[PDB]
Design a protein around this ligand. Sequence first.
Ligand SMILES: CN1CNS(=O)(=O)c2ccc(CCc3ccc4c(c3)N(C)CNS4(=O)=O)cc21
Ligand SMILES: N[C@@H](CCC(=O)O)C(=O)O
Ligand SMILES: N[C@@H](CCC(=O)O)C(=O)O
Ligand SMILES: [Cl-]
Ligand SMILES: [Cl-]
Ligand SMILES: [Cl-]
Ligand SMILES: [Cl-]
Ligand SMILES: [Cl-]
Lengths: 263, 260
Amino acid sequence: GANKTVVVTTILESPYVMMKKNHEMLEGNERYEGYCVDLAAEIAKHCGFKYKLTIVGDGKYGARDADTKIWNGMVGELVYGKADIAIAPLTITLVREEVIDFSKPFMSLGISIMIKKGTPIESAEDLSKQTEIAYGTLDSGSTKEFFRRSKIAVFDKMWTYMRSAEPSVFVRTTAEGVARVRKSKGKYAYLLESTMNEYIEQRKPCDTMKVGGNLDSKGYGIATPKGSSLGNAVNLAVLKLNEQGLLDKLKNKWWYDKGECGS
Amino acid sequence: KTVVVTTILESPYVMMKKNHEMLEGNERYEGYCVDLAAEIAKHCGFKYKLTIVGDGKYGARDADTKIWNGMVGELVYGKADIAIAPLTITLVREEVIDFSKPFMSLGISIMIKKGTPIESAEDLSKQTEIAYGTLDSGSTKEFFRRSKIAVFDKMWTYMRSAEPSVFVRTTAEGVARVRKSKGKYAYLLESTMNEYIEQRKPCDTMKVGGNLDSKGYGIATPKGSSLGNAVNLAVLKLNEQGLLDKLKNKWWYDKGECGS
Ligand SMILES: CN1CNS(=O)(=O)c2ccc(CCc3ccc4c(c3)N(C)CNS4(=O)=O)cc21
Ligand SMILES: N[C@@H](CCC(=O)O)C(=O)O
Ligand SMILES: N[C@@H](CCC(=O)O)C(=O)O
Ligand SMILES: [Cl-]
Ligand SMILES: [Cl-]
Ligand SMILES: [Cl-]
Ligand SMILES: [Cl-]
Ligand SMILES: [Cl-]
């Protein structure tokens, strides 16, 4: 049928999608800026569609409830037909690939540790062997699922602690995890993706840092409902943008050119 | 019912075992991709036969004839059912074959003989005393051929017309050329292979500078193959179980050939 505006689900996660200054008097896609806003424009141009950016209503990436089997977050928006495509830092995972399609990755990441500067922690093993410093993850995302499913001794030990810690060590948004690191005097460390960690390390007041190696290696992909006719063109567009150097330039633009912690 | 796997002799992905002359079939070979093939086949429920690509190439399309060679060609022309190899995901290949999600990350990188006064691709481009080149019929050569980045296009203009040829038939021949050229040849190759060689005797090469791009290897199937979906889920399962990282640690294991 006739071309229709593509509904893009995304999430307010800096620097991927952020409210522009003066957003209160802007409308539509002009309200937003960031890496995924720029990426959406490039994908749409290469694939020949018009689109509307829509922030996921529940503010979540996406997890399946173990009891009801209902998917929430951006994954749910695709599964239940509320959006046509997700352009966001959405991690490629097995359980998600069983229900939605992903392009080839547009960005690499691994799970990593964020500390308040000076915290005496260098690794996941360090965290797992002590109790003074609490630690947790984002809710409803791939990092929490990683720990829940891991059979690796250190990560299983970490999960066994996190799942029963009181008060809860889990946070609803990345910003809440950052705040908890910044306000806890070295007594909370946050497990989050290396991309987000490296972004925050360049934001004022420059009081956090990434420590240790990454715990895994994976990527973000552009997601579509299973069988969607958009998937093929989106995939080729991701590969073209990578090969032309545009994805690397976009990361530099939003992470480092705009950094607030020096050159 | 036996799946024909095309692969390539490239250390440490696929290597001939010691005493392979008295072995047969899949038991002749060892390495990262041999172990990976066994894991993929177990998860997908197929029997398979490893076969070394007949022309020894990864795969490129002839500009005049438009015929594909290498492992890509074996998939395109129906000579193999799947490629399990360090085969780079690229746009031109994704137009003719299918790739799983990546099983390993890499980028193009620079190999020098230790002590060579080169720190970056920009350094190479701004001089002519030290020659440099790439593997033929692979994704690194195509990267330079297609690139519009000023530094890389300048490098391509030099490499394509340099005499004698700066291109090599196999990775091992590029490494040998670095080792034998007294610092007058640098080799552009994928970071995975570079890092493997840097930890092998005689410990006379090193990786310099950052990677020039970021990409991955995928398991490839002919377009529309029924195996693609299961293979893709298998790669993700193996990654999430930690087995891909374990295999990398096994086959890049440093036994101290170089230093402590
Ligand atoms: C950025 N980019 C451009 N597109 S691409 O050429 O397809 C490509 C392939 C691989 C990677 C390296 C990072 C990664 C991403 C995703 C996964 C991984 C590993 N592994 C190692 C396991 N499987 S995965 O799909 O979760 C990046 C990449
Ligand atoms: N990128 C993750 C969210 C962040 C996290 O879990 O650390 C996801 O897609 O679920
Ligand atoms: N992995 C490459 C071969 C090595 C190279 O080109 O440096 C390919 O798939 O073509
Ligand atoms: Cl419309
Ligand atoms: Cl032998
Ligand atoms: Cl298993
Ligand atoms: Cl078999
Ligand atoms: Cl440029």
